[PDB]
Amino acid sequence: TENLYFQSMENFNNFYILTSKELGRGKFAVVRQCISKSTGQEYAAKFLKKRRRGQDCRAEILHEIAVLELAKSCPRVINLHEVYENTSEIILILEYAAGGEIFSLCLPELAEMVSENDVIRLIKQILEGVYYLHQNNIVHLDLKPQNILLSSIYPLGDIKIVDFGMSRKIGHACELREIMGTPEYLAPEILNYDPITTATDMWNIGIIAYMLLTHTSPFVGEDNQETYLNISQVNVDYSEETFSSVSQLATDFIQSLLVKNPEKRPTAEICLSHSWLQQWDFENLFHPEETSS
Numbered sequence: 001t002e003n004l005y006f007q008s009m010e011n012f013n014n015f016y017i018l019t020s021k022e023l024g025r026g027k028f029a030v031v032r033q034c035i036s037k038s039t040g041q042e043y044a045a046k047f048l049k050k051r052r053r054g055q056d057c058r059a060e061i062l063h064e065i066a067v068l069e070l071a072k073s074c075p076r077v078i079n080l081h082e083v084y085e086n087t088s089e090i091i092l093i094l095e096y097a098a099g100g101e102i103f104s105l106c107l108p109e110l111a112e113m114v115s116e117n118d119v120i121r122l123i124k125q126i127l128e129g130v131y132y133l134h135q136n137n138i139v140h141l142d143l144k145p146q147n148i149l150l151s152s153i154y155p156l157g158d159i160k161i162v163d164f165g166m167s168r169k170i171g172h173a174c175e176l177r178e179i180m181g182t183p184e185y186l187a188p189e190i191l192n193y194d195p196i197t198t199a200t201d202m203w204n205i206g207i208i209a210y211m212l213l214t215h216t217s218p219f220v221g222e223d224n225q226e227t228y229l230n231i232s233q234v235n236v237d238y239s240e241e242t243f244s245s246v247s248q249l250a251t252d253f254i255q256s257l258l259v260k261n262p263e264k265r266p267t268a269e270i271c272l273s274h275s276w277l278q279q280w281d282f283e284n285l286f287h288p289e290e291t292s293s
């Protein structure tokens with residue numbers, strides 16, 4: 001008996017054609033590439049079921065749209081173009097991140113195609129987006145590498161943060177939704193049920209840097225029990241073998257974030273001034289402290 005709020009499914013099919021590129025699939029969401037019939041511009045269409053696990057989720061979807069809308073001025077966060085609705089689904093028409101997941105750069109296979117320069121620029125862009133979110137009292141709470149996309153891979157483009165499905169305000173309760181992330185990506189405070197902090201996102205940025213640089217998962221074990229022990233003890237491989245091609249400054253950056261006590265983690269703003277991320281574009285003329293006069 002529910003009335004629909006967003007633009008009709010008839011309008012969706014009038015304005016867009018879905019392509020044979022299925023981009024993603026979870027239990028209650030599907031992402032498909034679509035094309036504007038008028039312009040030829042590619043978009044991502046995310047189909048969110050309004051009913052999940054026997055719960056009505058339209059209010060939660062509205063909240064997630066409210067968060068995307070707030071980030072429209074931030075180019076590090078995926079842009080929302082339009083919204084449609086049918087009996088079962090709310091459909092987000094998103095900016096299409098043609099490079100796909102940054103997770104692809106963390107596989108041993110693409111190690112060779114990704115530079116130190118590249119990792120520094122991608123971490124800096126992720127920090128710019130997370131800074132913007134934290135200044136607006138938004139904690140993402142699902143910053144796995146599968147939720148950071150790229151505008152292109154050949155050549156390497158710009159990052160786009162996606163999937164605000166878990167996002168909250170600072171100090172909201174850590175309940176079931178929280179503690180059902182992918183186990184190897186959960187912060188220690190989530191395992192202890194502590195109130196939400198911006199510091200949880202900073203833990204996840206540490207994991208992203210670790211995976212981009214080592215091509216290995218810092219916390220995953222043979223089973224969930226082992227994963228949860230690795231997180232809760234912060235048992236991370238910093239061996240000479242794993243880090244032989246990783247700079248000390250990158251190690252320092254990671255080791256500052258992967259710490260048990262969230263209050264000891266640096267903020268996004270402090271991370272943006274980290275010595276690792278300070279780099280001069282060699283094609284620019286540097287103006288040194290000793291002036292010609």
Ligand SMILES: O=C(O)CSc1ncnc2cc(-c3ccc(C4CC4)cc3)sc12
Pocket residue numbers: 023024031044046078094095096097098099100101149162163164
């Ligand atoms: O899950 C969400 O909340 C949004 S997911 C999404 N949003 C915007 N643009 C793209 C491009 C994708 C993409 C996936 C895979 C690939 C190629 C097959 C590997 C290329 C692009 S997924 C996506």
